[PDB]
mmCIF file of all heavy atoms in Angstrom:
data_model
loop_
_atom_site.group_PDB
_atom_site.id
_atom_site.type_symbol
_atom_site.label_atom_id
_atom_site.label_comp_id
_atom_site.label_asym_id
_atom_site.label_seq_id
_atom_site.Cartn_x
_atom_site.Cartn_y
_atom_site.Cartn_z
ATOM 1 N N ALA L 1 17.322 -15.735 -8.964
ATOM 2 C CA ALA L 1 16.093 -16.208 -9.487
ATOM 3 C C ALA L 1 15.189 -16.904 -8.616
ATOM 4 O O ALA L 1 13.988 -16.648 -8.668
ATOM 5 C CB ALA L 1 16.534 -17.221 -10.704
ATOM 6 N N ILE L 2 15.647 -17.786 -7.754
ATOM 7 C CA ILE L 2 14.776 -18.398 -6.755
ATOM 8 C C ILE L 2 14.202 -17.146 -5.748
ATOM 9 O O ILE L 2 13.120 -17.197 -5.304
ATOM 10 C CB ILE L 2 15.545 -19.280 -5.740
ATOM 11 C CG1 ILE L 2 15.815 -20.606 -6.718
ATOM 12 C CG2 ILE L 2 14.638 -19.932 -4.738
ATOM 13 C CD1 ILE L 2 16.727 -21.656 -5.991
ATOM 14 N N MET L 3 15.099 -16.149 -5.637
ATOM 15 C CA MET L 3 14.675 -15.021 -4.740
ATOM 16 C C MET L 3 13.730 -14.193 -5.364
ATOM 17 O O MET L 3 12.929 -13.414 -4.651
ATOM 18 C CB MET L 3 15.882 -14.261 -4.256
ATOM 19 C CG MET L 3 16.645 -14.922 -3.151
ATOM 20 S SD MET L 3 15.544 -15.730 -1.992
ATOM 21 C CE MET L 3 14.754 -14.265 -1.274
ATOM 22 N N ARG L 4 13.548 -14.220 -6.695
ATOM 23 C CA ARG L 4 12.504 -13.499 -7.372
ATOM 24 C C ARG L 4 11.134 -14.186 -7.206
ATOM 25 O O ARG L 4 10.030 -13.573 -7.494
ATOM 26 C CB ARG L 4 12.820 -13.251 -8.847
ATOM 27 C CG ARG L 4 13.717 -12.064 -9.091
ATOM 28 C CD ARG L 4 13.693 -11.637 -10.570
ATOM 29 N NE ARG L 4 14.899 -10.875 -10.865
ATOM 30 C CZ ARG L 4 15.932 -11.115 -11.412
ATOM 31 N NH1 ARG L 4 16.126 -12.529 -11.668
ATOM 32 N NH2 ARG L 4 17.008 -10.336 -11.576
ATOM 33 N N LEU L 5 11.186 -15.348 -6.726
ATOM 34 C CA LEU L 5 9.899 -16.184 -6.461
ATOM 35 C C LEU L 5 9.100 -15.502 -5.461
ATOM 36 O O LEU L 5 7.863 -15.564 -5.247
ATOM 37 C CB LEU L 5 10.137 -17.609 -6.289
ATOM 38 C CG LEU L 5 10.777 -18.390 -7.375
ATOM 39 C CD1 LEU L 5 11.021 -19.834 -7.069
ATOM 40 C CD2 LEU L 5 10.098 -18.200 -8.645
ATOM 41 N N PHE L 6 9.783 -14.802 -4.521
ATOM 42 C CA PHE L 6 9.296 -14.117 -3.361
ATOM 43 C C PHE L 6 8.645 -12.803 -3.645
ATOM 44 O O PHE L 6 7.911 -12.293 -2.857
ATOM 45 C CB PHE L 6 10.283 -14.042 -2.275
ATOM 46 C CG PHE L 6 10.712 -15.262 -1.621
ATOM 47 C CD1 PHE L 6 11.764 -15.939 -2.280
ATOM 48 C CD2 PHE L 6 10.177 -15.802 -0.500
ATOM 49 C CE1 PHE L 6 12.001 -17.247 -1.708
ATOM 50 C CE2 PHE L 6 10.484 -17.068 -0.044
ATOM 51 C CZ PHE L 6 11.486 -17.636 -0.644
ATOM 52 N N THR L 7 8.707 -12.157 -4.966
ATOM 53 C CA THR L 7 8.284 -10.877 -5.205
ATOM 54 C C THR L 7 6.760 -10.755 -5.191
ATOM 55 O O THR L 7 6.144 -11.679 -5.774
ATOM 56 C CB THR L 7 8.776 -10.315 -6.509
ATOM 57 O OG1 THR L 7 7.956 -10.702 -7.615
ATOM 58 C CG2 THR L 7 10.279 -10.532 -6.735
ATOM 59 N N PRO L 8 6.227 -9.931 -4.356
ATOM 60 C CA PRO L 8 4.772 -9.756 -4.172
ATOM 61 C C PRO L 8 4.014 -9.506 -5.416
ATOM 62 O O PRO L 8 4.669 -8.812 -6.386
ATOM 63 C CB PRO L 8 4.699 -8.642 -3.096
ATOM 64 C CG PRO L 8 5.878 -7.803 -3.458
ATOM 65 C CD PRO L 8 6.935 -8.828 -3.755
ATOM 66 N N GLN L 9 2.881 -10.033 -5.660
ATOM 67 C CA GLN L 9 2.049 -10.101 -6.858
ATOM 68 C C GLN L 9 0.929 -9.027 -6.894
ATOM 69 O O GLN L 9 0.173 -8.906 -7.716
ATOM 70 C CB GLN L 9 1.501 -11.400 -7.107
ATOM 71 C CG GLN L 9 2.593 -12.446 -7.523
ATOM 72 C CD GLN L 9 3.461 -11.970 -8.766
ATOM 73 O OE1 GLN L 9 2.813 -11.941 -9.833
ATOM 74 N NE2 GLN L 9 4.739 -11.718 -8.442
ATOM 75 N N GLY L 10 0.923 -8.183 -5.827
ATOM 76 C CA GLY L 10 -0.299 -7.371 -5.763
ATOM 77 C C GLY L 10 0.011 -5.927 -6.191
ATOM 78 O O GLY L 10 0.585 -5.790 -7.420
ATOM 79 N N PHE L 11 -0.435 -4.887 -5.660
ATOM 80 C CA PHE L 11 -0.125 -3.456 -6.055
ATOM 81 C C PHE L 11 -0.470 -2.597 -4.862
ATOM 82 O O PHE L 11 -0.970 -2.972 -3.866
ATOM 83 C CB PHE L 11 -1.130 -3.052 -7.125
ATOM 84 C CG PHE L 11 -2.482 -2.678 -6.538
ATOM 85 C CD1 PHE L 11 -2.975 -1.428 -6.320
ATOM 86 C CD2 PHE L 11 -3.440 -3.761 -6.209
ATOM 87 C CE1 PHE L 11 -4.325 -1.207 -5.773
ATOM 88 C CE2 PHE L 11 -4.611 -3.478 -5.718
ATOM 89 C CZ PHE L 11 -5.199 -2.116 -5.546
ATOM 90 N N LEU L 12 0.238 -1.452 -4.952
ATOM 91 C CA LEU L 12 0.244 -0.393 -3.800
ATOM 92 C C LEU L 12 -0.964 0.584 -3.884
ATOM 93 O O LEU L 12 -0.807 1.777 -4.558
ATOM 94 C CB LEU L 12 1.550 0.251 -3.741
ATOM 95 C CG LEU L 12 1.651 1.135 -2.439
ATOM 96 C CD1 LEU L 12 1.726 0.165 -1.385
ATOM 97 C CD2 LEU L 12 2.848 2.123 -2.584
ATOM 98 N N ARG L 13 -1.968 0.259 -3.216
ATOM 99 C CA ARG L 13 -3.128 1.153 -3.189
ATOM 100 C C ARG L 13 -2.896 2.350 -2.285
ATOM 101 O O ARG L 13 -2.260 2.267 -1.198
ATOM 102 C CB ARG L 13 -4.326 0.263 -2.385
ATOM 103 C CG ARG L 13 -5.581 0.442 -3.138
ATOM 104 C CD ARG L 13 -6.743 -0.385 -2.581
ATOM 105 N NE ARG L 13 -8.039 0.182 -2.842
ATOM 106 C CZ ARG L 13 -8.553 1.249 -2.268
ATOM 107 N NH1 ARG L 13 -8.034 1.675 -1.197
ATOM 108 N NH2 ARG L 13 -9.781 1.673 -2.593
ATOM 109 N N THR L 14 -3.399 3.553 -2.650
ATOM 110 C CA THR L 14 -3.482 4.639 -1.742
ATOM 111 C C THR L 14 -4.795 4.396 -0.922
ATOM 112 O O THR L 14 -5.629 3.650 -1.191
ATOM 113 C CB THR L 14 -3.750 5.948 -2.516
ATOM 114 O OG1 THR L 14 -2.586 6.129 -3.439
ATOM 115 C CG2 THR L 14 -3.771 7.097 -1.549
ATOM 116 N N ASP L 15 -4.760 4.966 0.384
ATOM 117 C CA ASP L 15 -5.872 4.650 1.270
ATOM 118 C C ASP L 15 -7.013 5.815 1.076
ATOM 119 O O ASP L 15 -7.206 6.613 2.037
ATOM 120 C CB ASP L 15 -5.352 4.594 2.635
ATOM 121 C CG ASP L 15 -4.973 3.179 2.979
ATOM 122 O OD1 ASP L 15 -5.384 2.202 2.472
ATOM 123 O OD2 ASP L 15 -4.004 3.075 3.863
ATOM 124 N N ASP L 16 -7.502 5.910 -0.203
ATOM 125 C CA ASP L 16 -8.305 7.026 -0.562
ATOM 126 C C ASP L 16 -9.592 7.371 0.229
ATOM 127 O O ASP L 16 -9.862 8.475 0.523
ATOM 128 C CB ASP L 16 -8.655 6.971 -2.057
ATOM 129 C CG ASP L 16 -9.671 5.770 -2.359
ATOM 130 O OD1 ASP L 16 -9.580 4.861 -1.601
ATOM 131 O OD2 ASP L 16 -10.375 6.019 -3.247
ATOM 132 N N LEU L 17 -10.259 6.331 0.550
ATOM 133 C CA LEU L 17 -11.506 6.373 1.446
ATOM 134 C C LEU L 17 -11.157 6.849 2.793
ATOM 135 O O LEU L 17 -11.877 7.628 3.439
ATOM 136 C CB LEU L 17 -12.190 5.161 1.362
ATOM 137 C CG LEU L 17 -12.750 4.702 -0.052
ATOM 138 C CD1 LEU L 17 -12.735 3.218 -0.232
ATOM 139 C CD2 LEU L 17 -14.187 5.157 -0.174
ATOM 140 N N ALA L 18 -9.978 6.298 3.367
ATOM 141 C CA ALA L 18 -9.462 6.750 4.629
ATOM 142 C C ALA L 18 -8.998 8.253 4.576
ATOM 143 O O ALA L 18 -9.115 8.909 5.702
ATOM 144 C CB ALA L 18 -8.494 5.826 5.049
ATOM 145 N N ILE L 19 -8.633 8.665 3.521
ATOM 146 C CA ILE L 19 -8.152 10.124 3.435
ATOM 147 C C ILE L 19 -9.282 11.087 3.232
ATOM 148 O O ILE L 19 -9.276 12.147 3.843
ATOM 149 C CB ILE L 19 -7.213 10.192 2.273
ATOM 150 C CG1 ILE L 19 -6.036 9.439 2.498
ATOM 151 C CG2 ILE L 19 -6.687 11.642 2.244
ATOM 152 C CD1 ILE L 19 -5.070 9.284 1.263
ATOM 153 N N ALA L 20 -10.337 10.568 2.502
ATOM 154 C CA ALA L 20 -11.643 11.465 2.278
ATOM 155 C C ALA L 20 -12.321 11.359 3.505
ATOM 156 O O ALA L 20 -13.004 12.422 3.910
ATOM 157 C CB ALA L 20 -12.492 10.799 1.175
ATOM 158 N N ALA L 21 -12.293 10.370 4.390
ATOM 159 C CA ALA L 21 -12.913 10.261 5.803
ATOM 160 C C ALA L 21 -12.243 11.013 6.765
ATOM 161 O O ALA L 21 -12.638 11.138 7.829
ATOM 162 C CB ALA L 21 -13.200 8.853 6.064
ATOM 163 N N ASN L 22 -10.991 11.514 6.287
ATOM 164 C CA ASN L 22 -10.153 12.174 7.290
ATOM 165 C C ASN L 22 -9.769 11.295 8.456
ATOM 166 O O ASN L 22 -9.760 11.867 9.619
ATOM 167 C CB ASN L 22 -10.717 13.549 7.738
ATOM 168 C CG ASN L 22 -9.749 14.733 7.822
ATOM 169 O OD1 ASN L 22 -8.592 14.446 7.884
ATOM 170 N ND2 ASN L 22 -10.259 15.849 7.623
ATOM 171 N N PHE L 23 -9.562 9.980 8.227
ATOM 172 C CA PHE L 23 -9.106 9.163 9.288
ATOM 173 C C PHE L 23 -7.677 9.306 9.617
ATOM 174 O O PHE L 23 -6.909 9.743 8.747
ATOM 175 C CB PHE L 23 -9.334 7.603 8.810
ATOM 176 C CG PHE L 23 -10.723 7.132 9.058
ATOM 177 C CD1 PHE L 23 -11.193 6.165 8.170
ATOM 178 C CD2 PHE L 23 -11.616 7.850 9.918
ATOM 179 C CE1 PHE L 23 -12.578 5.686 8.294
ATOM 180 C CE2 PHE L 23 -12.852 7.330 10.031
ATOM 181 C CZ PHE L 23 -13.376 6.344 9.313
ATOM 182 N N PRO L 24 -7.360 9.090 10.907
ATOM 183 C CA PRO L 24 -5.946 9.361 11.328
ATOM 184 C C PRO L 24 -5.023 8.529 10.556
ATOM 185 O O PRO L 24 -5.319 7.288 10.193
ATOM 186 C CB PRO L 24 -5.957 8.947 12.839
ATOM 187 C CG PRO L 24 -7.090 7.888 12.861
ATOM 188 C CD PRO L 24 -8.141 8.301 11.959
ATOM 189 N N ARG L 25 -3.780 8.979 10.269
ATOM 190 C CA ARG L 25 -2.867 8.290 9.551
ATOM 191 C C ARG L 25 -1.474 8.874 9.647
ATOM 192 O O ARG L 25 -1.169 10.049 9.283
ATOM 193 C CB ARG L 25 -3.239 8.234 8.071
ATOM 194 C CG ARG L 25 -3.081 6.954 7.314
ATOM 195 C CD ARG L 25 -4.439 6.294 6.887
ATOM 196 N NE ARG L 25 -5.274 5.753 7.984
ATOM 197 C CZ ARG L 25 -6.136 4.755 7.912
ATOM 198 N NH1 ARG L 25 -6.201 4.147 6.689
ATOM 199 N NH2 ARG L 25 -6.724 4.299 9.004
ATOM 200 N N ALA L 26 -0.557 7.986 10.222
ATOM 201 C CA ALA L 26 0.880 8.515 10.451
ATOM 202 C C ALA L 26 1.672 8.897 9.120
ATOM 203 O O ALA L 26 2.559 9.643 9.197
ATOM 204 C CB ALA L 26 1.670 7.385 11.251
ATOM 205 N N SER L 27 1.353 8.151 8.089
ATOM 206 C CA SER L 27 2.136 8.428 6.882
ATOM 207 C C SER L 27 1.784 9.803 6.244
ATOM 208 O O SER L 27 0.565 10.138 6.292
ATOM 209 C CB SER L 27 1.807 7.320 5.839
ATOM 210 O OG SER L 27 2.772 7.537 4.659
ATOM 211 N N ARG L 28 2.699 10.464 5.515
ATOM 212 C CA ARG L 28 2.459 11.718 4.961
ATOM 213 C C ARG L 28 1.483 11.426 3.715
ATOM 214 O O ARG L 28 0.598 12.144 3.562
ATOM 215 C CB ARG L 28 3.794 12.238 4.286
ATOM 216 C CG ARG L 28 3.571 13.214 3.108
ATOM 217 C CD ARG L 28 4.544 14.380 3.291
ATOM 218 N NE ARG L 28 4.382 15.090 4.614
ATOM 219 C CZ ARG L 28 3.453 15.860 4.892
ATOM 220 N NH1 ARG L 28 2.691 16.385 3.911
ATOM 221 N NH2 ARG L 28 3.414 16.519 5.997
ATOM 222 N N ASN L 29 1.704 10.264 2.950
ATOM 223 C CA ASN L 29 0.732 9.938 2.016
ATOM 224 C C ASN L 29 0.365 8.314 2.334
ATOM 225 O O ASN L 29 1.073 7.497 2.072
ATOM 226 C CB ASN L 29 1.284 10.104 0.530
ATOM 227 C CG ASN L 29 2.826 9.922 0.478
ATOM 228 O OD1 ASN L 29 3.417 10.898 0.267
ATOM 229 N ND2 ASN L 29 3.343 8.747 0.756
ATOM 230 N N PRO L 30 -0.845 8.213 2.907
ATOM 231 C CA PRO L 30 -1.238 6.859 3.488
ATOM 232 C C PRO L 30 -1.314 5.911 2.167
ATOM 233 O O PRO L 30 -1.789 6.327 1.192
ATOM 234 C CB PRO L 30 -2.658 7.122 3.992
ATOM 235 C CG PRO L 30 -2.721 8.590 4.254
ATOM 236 C CD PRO L 30 -1.835 9.277 3.240
ATOM 237 N N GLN L 31 -1.012 4.603 2.519
ATOM 238 C CA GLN L 31 -0.885 3.624 1.440
ATOM 239 C C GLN L 31 -0.912 2.239 2.086
ATOM 240 O O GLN L 31 -0.953 2.206 3.309
ATOM 241 C CB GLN L 31 0.407 3.672 0.669
ATOM 242 C CG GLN L 31 0.403 4.552 -0.504
ATOM 243 C CD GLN L 31 1.692 5.090 -0.868
ATOM 244 O OE1 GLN L 31 2.760 4.871 -0.129
ATOM 245 N NE2 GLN L 31 1.812 5.925 -1.945
ATOM 246 N N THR L 32 -1.189 1.213 1.155
ATOM 247 C CA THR L 32 -1.176 -0.076 1.699
ATOM 248 C C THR L 32 -0.913 -1.026 0.471
ATOM 249 O O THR L 32 -1.232 -0.682 -0.643
ATOM 250 C CB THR L 32 -2.621 -0.356 2.192
ATOM 251 O OG1 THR L 32 -2.765 -1.608 2.827
ATOM 252 C CG2 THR L 32 -3.647 -0.211 0.993
ATOM 253 N N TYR L 33 -0.357 -2.071 0.707
ATOM 254 C CA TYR L 33 -0.067 -3.074 -0.347
ATOM 255 C C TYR L 33 -1.128 -4.179 -0.383
ATOM 256 O O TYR L 33 -1.183 -4.995 0.543
ATOM 257 C CB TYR L 33 1.282 -3.786 -0.248
ATOM 258 C CG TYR L 33 1.721 -4.293 -1.538
ATOM 259 C CD1 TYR L 33 2.257 -3.543 -2.648
ATOM 260 C CD2 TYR L 33 1.737 -5.662 -1.595
ATOM 261 C CE1 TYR L 33 2.540 -4.099 -3.779
ATOM 262 C CE2 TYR L 33 2.199 -6.259 -2.887
ATOM 263 C CZ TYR L 33 2.569 -5.532 -3.871
ATOM 264 O OH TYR L 33 3.017 -6.078 -5.109
#
């Protein structure tokens, strides 16, 4: 329960503008939290 206090509160964005811009990206599907 104390360990659940550490769970991140955001969300996992795709890097959509970076993909449309054809920016370099090591991941098969670029993302970021």
Side-chain angles (χ1 to χ4, degrees):
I2 296 173
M3 283 322 292
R4 281 199 194 94
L5 299 183
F6 295 83
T7 83
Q9 291 299 293
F11 76 101
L12 188 70
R13 226 177 159 277
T14 304
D15 282 328
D16 70 328
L17 299 141
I19 307 174
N22 225 333
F23 279 155
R25 221 120 285 213
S27 185
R28 159 139 305 275
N29 29 252
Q31 270 153 359
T32 187
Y33 195 74

